[PDB]
């Protein structure tokens, strides 16, 4: 298996843990929920 | 520190500031903190020939060892190091032109660091029962 996908210049929300490892990420322009996650700079935005 | 991998030598905060690094030669790791920055709260009375200085939230040892040495008398108040004022918090004043915060005042005759008590109860010696 050799899965490939195109790359492009995109803005991402990168979350780093207490040891410097990227544990989670969000593609900001991918969907409406991703836009809320990037706007609030959090993986689980507050109810609103 | 244990978070630096083989290719990493700089630690950054969420704002893009350098806050730590690993020395390329000695491999020793250090945290970088900003140098102290602050203000001096100076209390002045027109009849005085000097000032009462308050280094807010700073111990007098810190002021003398890391900011500046001086010949003025000093003491550690609740609000921070106070210079050129006598510690007289046991005394109180109902009016105060130099209000320093948390019920403290600077009173000039020298300057006195005194408690500020603008209001008090009218007392009577009548029975409670």
């Amino acid at each position: 298996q050799y899965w490939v996908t195109p790359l492009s210049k995109r803005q991402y929300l990168l979350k780093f843990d207490n040891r410097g490892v990227i544990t989670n990420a969000v593609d900001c322009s991918s969907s409406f929920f991703s836009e809320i996650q990037c706007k609030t700079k959090s993986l689980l935005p507050n109810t609103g | 520190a244990v978070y630096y991998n083989s290719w990493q030598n700089l630690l950054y905060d969420s704002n893009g500031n350098i806050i730590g690094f690993k020395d390329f030669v000695t491999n020793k790791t250090y945290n970088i903190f900003p140098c102290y920055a602050g203000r001096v709260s100076a209390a002045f009375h027109q009849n005085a020939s000097s000032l009462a200085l308050l280094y807010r939230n700073l111990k007098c040892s810190y002021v003398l060892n890391n900011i500046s040495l001086t010949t003025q008398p000093y003491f550690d108040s609740y609000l921070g190091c106070v210079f050129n004022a006598d510690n007289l918090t046991d005394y109180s004043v109902s009016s105060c032109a130099l209000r320093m915060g948390s019920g403290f005042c600077v009173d000039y005759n020298s300057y006195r660091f005194v408690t500020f008590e603008p209001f008090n109860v009218s007392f009577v010696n009548d029975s409670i029962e």
Binding site: - | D13, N15, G16, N17, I19, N31, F33, P34, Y36, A37, G38, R39, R56, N57, L58, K59, Y62, Y78, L79, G80, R99, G101, S102, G103, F116, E117, P118, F119, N120, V121, S122, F123, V124, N125, D126, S127, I128
Partner: protein, 439 residues
């Protein structure tokens, strides 16, 4: 109306309900050093900032006036709490904490200067330990900025960038001493904050004024006192769960922390310049172009300060309004009972009490709450004897045992009609029920 009577649900039993209300009377006294915020330590920035001249003098002056308004407001609130308070020197809160079966031990701190700063009630202790950034909280947080700790407290970064919150002119311990004095002034003679009469009698007369006969009040005094201290306990236990008043108190600290953090984030905005860092600009460009980039940062940071100062002026206007309302509630709900229906909280307001809270005052409004109701037929007036009209005072006329009697509007207790509970008229109005056999 059947004949001349209407159907009304009159209470047959009641309880006392306590309601909290936090009124913000103060806010953190934010000070900006405009020079240190805009330019940090960089001489090339300070030279340019001098050419903007009076912009930093305006930022400093407007915030000094705003902080002066907050200090004047705090003195006015303290003056209001202590206005007319007279206490006996024989009063010792360690032994004197309950009277007439009503317990104020939780609402009263130690009294007198021998305690020092310990003049805070159990109620205020329980309300202050849930808020980290109170006046003492800010002082302790700023004290830790030079403690050499590895923890990067956001308040320390803000203060090093010239953004520091100063303590209020009166500590929250002094204000708790003033609320304690105002509270004991209602429990013991001369009762200077309880209409000059015992607290239980003031509660009884206030409940009677709602349309409750005094006969049930002076025999249910134990039940009234137990309902009153149970309402107080319900208020105290309400802070251990999601509470609207505690959330309102925490909103003051959260909104201030959000505004200060938002102001600090302006130091990382590029404002169209090559970098948000003055060190990077000065290490990449010479004076002819570095000054252009530094001027972009100066305009952006000064614009951010003018916006923050406009927001602070608006917020302090709201705090002055809230402090005026709190002073009015002290005077017209705690020290006295003004004839205004829903001013001191909702419902049949009996009486109110006050306690100190972070950046404000917490009022406890006690109300007469009906438990059970009886549907009865009432007459709003009667035409008696020689066509003389009578109207009931804070009650209704009732046919009890096929005889006309009076009952209070807030408690069903039929009692004989007399000049004590009647308004007389020389002529009776139309539709007043005809009763020639009365009096």
């Amino acid at each position: 109306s059947v004949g001349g009577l209407y159907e009304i649900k009159i209470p047959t039993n009641f309880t006392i309900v306590g309601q909290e209300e936090f009124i913000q009377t103060n806010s953190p006294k934010v000070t900006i050093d405009c020079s240190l915020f805009v330019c940090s330590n960089y001489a090339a920035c300070h030279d340019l900032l001098s050419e903007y001249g009076t912009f930093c003098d305006n930022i400093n002056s407007i915030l000094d006036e705003v902080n002066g308004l907050l200090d004047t407001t705090q003195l006015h609130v303290a003056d209001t709490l202590m206005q007319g308070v007279t206490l006996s020197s024989n009063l010792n809160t360690n032994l004197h904490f309950d009277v007439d079966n009503i317990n104020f031990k939780s609402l009263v701190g130690c009294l007198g200067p021998h305690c020092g700063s310990s003049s805070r009630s159990f109620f205020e202790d329980l309300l202050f330990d849930k808020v980290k950034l109170s006046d003492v909280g800010f002082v302790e947080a700023y004290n830790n900025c030079t403690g050499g700790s590895e923890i990067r407290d956001l308040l320390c970064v803000q203060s090093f960038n010239g953004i520091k919150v100063l303590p209020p002119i009166l500590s929250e311990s002094q204000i708790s001493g003033y609320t304690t004095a105002a509270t004991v002034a209602a429990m013991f003679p001369p009762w200077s904050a309880a209409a000059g009469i015992p607290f239980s009698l003031n509660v009884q007369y206030r409940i009677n004024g709602l349309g409750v006969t005094m006969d049930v009040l002076n025999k249910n005094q134990k039940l009234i006192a137990t309902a009153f201290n149970n309402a107080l306990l319900s208020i105290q236990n309400g802070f251990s769960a999601p509470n609207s008043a505690l959330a309102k108190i925490q909103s003051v600290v959260n909104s201030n922390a959000q505004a200060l953090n938002s102001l600090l984030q302006q130091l990382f905005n590029k404002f169209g310049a090559i970098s948000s860092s003055l060190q990077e600009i000065l290490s990449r460009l010479d004076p002819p172009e570095a000054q252009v980039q530094i001027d972009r940062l100066i305009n952006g940071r000064l614009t951010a300060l003018n916006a923050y100062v406009s927001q602070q002026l608006s917020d302090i206007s709201l705090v002055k309004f809230g402090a005026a309302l709190a002073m009015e509630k002290v005077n017209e709900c705690v020290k006295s009972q003004s004839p205004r229906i829903n001013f001191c909280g909702n419902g049949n307001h009996i009486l109110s009490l006050v306690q100190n809270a972070p950046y404000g005052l917490l009022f406890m409004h006690f109300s007469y709450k009906p438990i059970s109701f009886k549907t009865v037929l009432v007459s709003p007036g009667l035409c008696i004897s020689g066509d003389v009209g009578i109207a009931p005072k804070q009650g209704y006329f009732i046919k009890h045992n096929d005889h006309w009697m009076f009952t209070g509007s807030s408690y069903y207790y039929p009692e004989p009609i007399s000049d004590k509970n009647v308004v007389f008229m020389n002529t009776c109005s139309v539709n007043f029920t005809k009763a020639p056999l009365v009096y």
